[PDB]
Amino acid sequence: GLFGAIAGFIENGWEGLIDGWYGYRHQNAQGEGTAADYKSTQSAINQITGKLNRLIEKTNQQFELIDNEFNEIEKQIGNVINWTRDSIIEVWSYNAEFLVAVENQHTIDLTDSEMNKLYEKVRRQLRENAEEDGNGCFEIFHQCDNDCMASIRNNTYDHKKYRKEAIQNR
């Protein structure tokens, strides 16, 4: 990816996570839990489904026979047919390979963006109260129980509340 998040600064993704596409993994007073993010997952899926809306259909472009399977058309005109049919098949084949290569590049770079997008808006929730690990983890100076974890994920978290004990724990 161009955003260097998926198989980049994030060592890798978690084979457990059967709940969504991007998620949270916590370690606190209480022990551990791992839980899926609906918003980042839904944004990626909205945009992957949006590419398949574009492609999965067909344009009304219908064709009739200009040569004959059973009984070969005159040779002069037939060469031109074959060559024109060959030049068109050569061109649609480049066009499909390159559309899909471009769609695959942007599909990956897009998911890599939604990984980074979640990380950054979590980083902003904790303005002073925590500092970046670097393996895509946030180390919190203040202790953060399952109610405090559910508030970052539930996106109700109050930085104002824990800034007191966290900041002074420089």
Partner: protein, 315 residues
């Protein structure tokens, strides 16, 4: 104590390609290149004619194989490999131009041209075209001298297309398989057939002599055809060696001609056909048949073009 961000994965991954790399692994991915055929002609709620042994061009002149279709009416015309346009051996001229016309014709209504003859046999027939007994083409008349060697008389027959639509007119020229026979059927002397509309004008003379036997005729009957504009008039003058029409064809409407080896099925519906059957698929490409027709996906050379529907895959 701490919180941690990341993404999902499974180690049952799928390979895709990009501008940058050949065979990146991802979460979910889909085929865009349909390669699953239906070995049927999916014909539901489309008026479908199966010519089988009938040649498509044969519907216009009416060999036995075609007697069920002299006035066929269809949105979907299925030409078959076994299907054969004639009985007394011969070709149609620009046969394929004429096929392309009929394939899109919606079928054909026959209308009487209203020729009738005097001082010629009209009833000339052939074991090549048997129905029950030596017969001939349905729509045609095989004009012969009254007696063996009798002199087929110079003659003209004219037909004005008074209809709003152009009339398909066919006629034949008879290559007797010996100049001996030519003269037995038509009388000696060079035989001439000239045909003309406002705009068309062509001469035809028979080239008697022995071709190979086919359905048991060393002779040959080549068909020629034109599309008579309305208020236009085809004139046939001829000397003999002329196979007259009896009926004009008028095209019915719109249809689609397909060449196919696949059986009918009025249970399924489908928009896209080829020699091997029907392509039903919403995928943007296909690798089944570059010669498929109907409403189809763009055919591509590639066996497979996997499109990413999930992020990069990291175990």
């Amino acid at each position: 104590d701490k919180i941690c961000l990341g993404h999902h994965a499974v180690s049952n991954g799928t390979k895709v390609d990009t501008l940058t790399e050949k065979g990146i692994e991802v979460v979910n991915a889909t085929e865009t290149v349909e390669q699953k055929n239906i070995p049927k002609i999916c014909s539901k709620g489309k008026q479908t004619i199966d010519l089988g042994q009938c040649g498509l061009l044969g519907t216009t002149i009416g060999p036995p194989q075609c007697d069920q279709f002299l006035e066929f009416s269809a949105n979907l015309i299925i030409e078959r490999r076994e299907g054969d346009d004639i009985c007394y051996p011969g070709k149609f001229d620009n046969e394929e131009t004429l096929r392309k016309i009929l394939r899109k014709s919606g079928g054909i209504k026959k209308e009487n041209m209203g020729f009738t003859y005097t001082g010629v046999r009209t009833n000339g027939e052939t074991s090549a075209c048997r129905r029950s007994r030596s017969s001939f083409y349905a729509e045609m008349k095989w004009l012969l001298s009254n007696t063996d060697n009798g002199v087929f008389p110079q003659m003209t027959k004219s037909y004005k297309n008074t209809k709003r639509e152009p009339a398909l007119i066919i006629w034949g020229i008879h290559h007797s398989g010996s100049t001996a026979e030519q003269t037995r059927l038509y009388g000696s002397g060079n035989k001439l057939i000239t045909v003309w509309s406002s705009k068309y004008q062509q001469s035809f003379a028979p080239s008697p002599g022995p071709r190979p036997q086919i359905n048991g005729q060393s002779g040959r009957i080549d068909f020629y055809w034109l599309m008579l504009d309305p208020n236009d008039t085809v004139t046939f003058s001829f000397n003999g060696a002329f196979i007259a029409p009896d009926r004009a064809s008028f095209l019915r409407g719109k249809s689609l001609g397909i060449q196919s080896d696949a059986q009918l099925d009025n249970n399924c519906e489908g928009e896209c056909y080829h020699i091997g059957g029907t392509i039903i698929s919403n995928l943007p490409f296909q690798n089944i048949n570059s010669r498929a027709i109907g409403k189809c996906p763009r055919y591509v050379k590639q066996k497979s073009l996997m499109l990413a529907t999930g992020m990069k895959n990291v175990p």
